[PDB]
Amino acid sequence: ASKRALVILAKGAEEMETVIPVDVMRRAGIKVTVAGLAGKDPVQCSRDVVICPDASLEDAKKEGPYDVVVLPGGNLGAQNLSESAAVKEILKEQENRKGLIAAICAGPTALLAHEIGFGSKVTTHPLAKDKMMNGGHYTYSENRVEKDGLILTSRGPGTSFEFALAIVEALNGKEVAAQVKAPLVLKD
Amino acid sequence: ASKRALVILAKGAEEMETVIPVDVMRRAGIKVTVAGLAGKDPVQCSRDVVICPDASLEDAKKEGPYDVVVLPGGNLGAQNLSESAAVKEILKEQENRKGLIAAICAGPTALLAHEIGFGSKVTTHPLAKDKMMNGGHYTYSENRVEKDGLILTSRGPGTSFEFALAIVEALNGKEVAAQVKAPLVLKD
């Protein structure tokens, strides 16, 4: 009866945008797998924090399906996501089964790369807007968190908490999100 | 001409309270060492995120002094900090040289354990208040970030950004803090 989350961790990911959702989602009782794009080996994030993944993406792919697939940001991390064929297959399958797809900051640009969710309202970091909007395949929003259909996006490291709680609320409901939020000492 | 920060990472530390300051401080051009209390080996944080430290605390101790020593929270992480004699020696030396000491959430309780900064105004997570105030050696504040003398404290995972920017401002000044803050997409 346990919801399941896949977080895809590539070299150059924004470490704050990776750790905050993982931690919050685990506080909500979600089973999270931090999967390394390139294998089980430690991943050097954008600000040189080094994180050990729970599994390789190849292994994690075989233990699906997930209720949410999570793409962190970081410019080089998103580019690695955008170039990976395994990511494409994972995302295309999640879209077909109408599962949730969540991406933050530069992460949403991998959706464009993989032709995921065209027609949806999305947000990105302001510095990634032009890249996301090439072709006019999405409609842009400046909301800190944006959810359109099964596509949930958010803007930057400072929106990471609101992004993660929106995932909790989508998966486990508003009461669990409010319960997990109180001990965090968030402002709003 | 580079300021230097020591972050002490023990098993059971709150990973968000560890990664956010490290990342932000590195964005501000500070040289940060993430030092493992028990050695160079990977550290399992409170929500099972596993982080590889930059060095063992023993090695990092020999490459001082630091302009700031940073104690993350997490209940079991703070307890490990509070029990470590190496931490005591590091903190007592930082206090004598009038260097900054920064602790968040449950982290400040290690200060009490090591008899650091008595008489100062401090904050903690609300759930750690009673422990910090045993003996009445400090005055309690409910400000999200509190700074009294060389002692800088903060309340929880959700104050992590404000805590980290206060460190930047203390070390590098208000203009650098404001420059580092803008691309984060913080609310206030």
The residue extents of the domains of chain B are 1-187
As a whole number of angstroms, the distance between CA B96 and CA B99 comes to 8
Give the separation between CA A114 and CA A83, rounded to whole angstroms.
9
Helix, coil or strand: residue B28: coil
Closest CA to A139 of A153, A154, A120, A125: A120
Q: Which two tokens stand for residue A12?
A: 């150059």
Q: Is B57 helix (H, G, I), strand (E, B) or coil?
A: helix
- Give the integer Cα–Cα distance in Å for A52 and B56: 17
Distance of CA A70 to the CA centre of its chain: 3
Q: Give Cα separations from A188 to A25, A89, B124, B186 (angstroms).
A: 19, 37, 19, 12
State the Cα–Cα distance between residues B106 and B21, nearest whole angstrom. Answer: 15
Count the residues in chain B: 188
Residues 37-76 of B with CB under 8 A from A: 42, 46-52
Reply yes or no on whether B137 is catalytic. no
The answer to whether the CB of A152 falls within 8 A of the CB of A164 is no
Question: Scanning the structure block, which residue is given the tokens 């807007």?
Answer: A129
Residue of B161, B151, B156 lying closest to B127 (CA atoms): B156
Which CATH code for domain A1-187? 3.40.50.880
Longest dimension (CA), chain A: 43
Contact B48 A26 (CB under 8 A): yes
In Å, how far is A70's CA from the nearest CA of chain B? 16
Mutate which: B40, B49, B127, B129, vs A, most A CBs within 10 A = B49
* Residue B183 to residues A105, A153, A186, B28, B174, Cα–Cα distance (Å): 11, 17, 20, 12, 16
Q: What is the number of other CB atoms lying within 10 angstroms of the CB of residue B139?
A: 12
Contact B49 A27 (CB under 8 A): no
The three-state (H, E, C) secondary structure of chain A, written as one string: CCCEEEEEECCCCCHHHHHHHHHHHHHCCCEEEEEECCCCCCEECCCCCEEECCEEHHHHHCCCCCCEEEECCCHHHHHHHHHCHHHHHHHHHHHHCCCEEEEECCCCHHHHHCCCCCCCEECCCHHHHHHHCCCCCCEECCCCEEEECCEEEECCHHHHHHHHHHHHHHHHCHHHHHHHHHHHCCCC
Phi, psi of A157 (to 5 degrees): -60, -40
Chain A neighbors of B157, CB-CB under 8 A: 23, 184-185
Q: Which amino acid is at B100?
A: L
Q: What token pair was written down for A55?
A: 């599994």
Cα angle value A31/A107/A179 (rounded, 5°): 40
Q: Using CA atoms in the order A18, A19, A24, A25, what is the torsion angle rounded to 10 degrees?
A: 50
Between the alpha carbon of residue A21 and those of residues A5, A30, A124, A166, B53, the distances in Å are 10, 11, 17, 10, 21
Q: How far is CA A113 from CA A87, A91, A136, B114, in A?
A: 10, 11, 13, 53
Q: Does B20 touch chain A (CB under 8 A)?
A: yes
Tokens of A5: 């989350």
Q: Which residue in the block uniquely carries the two structure tokens 């395949």?
A: A137
Q: Fill in the DSSP letter of residue B135.
A: T
Experimental determination technique: X-ray
Residue B62 and residue B95 in contact, taking contact as beta carbons nearer than 8 Å = no
Identify the CA nearest to B10 among candidates B102, B114, B82.
B82
List the beta bridge partners of residue A153. Answer: A103, A146
Q: Enter the tokens of residue A130.
A: 């032009």
Rounded to whole angstroms, the Cα distance separating B68 from A160 reads 26
Give dist(CA B143, CA A21) in Å, integer: 25
CB within 8 A of B90, min separation 6: which ones? B6, B8, B57, B61, B69
Q: How far apart are CA A185 and CA B123, in angstroms?
A: 12
- Using CA atoms, how far apart are residues A172 and A165, in angstroms rounded to an integer? 10
Query: Which residues of chain B form beta strands (DSSP E)?
Result: 4-9, 31-36, 43-44, 50-52, 55-56, 68-71, 100-104, 121-122, 139-140, 145-148, 151-154
CA distances from A182 to A177, B74, B75, B85, B156 (A): 9, 16, 17, 34, 11
A188 touches chain B (CB under 8 A): yes
Residue B153: DSSP 8-state: E
Q: In 10 A of CB A178, how many CB atoms?
A: 12
Coil, helix or strand at residue B19: helix
Please tell me what DSSP assigns to residue B45.
-
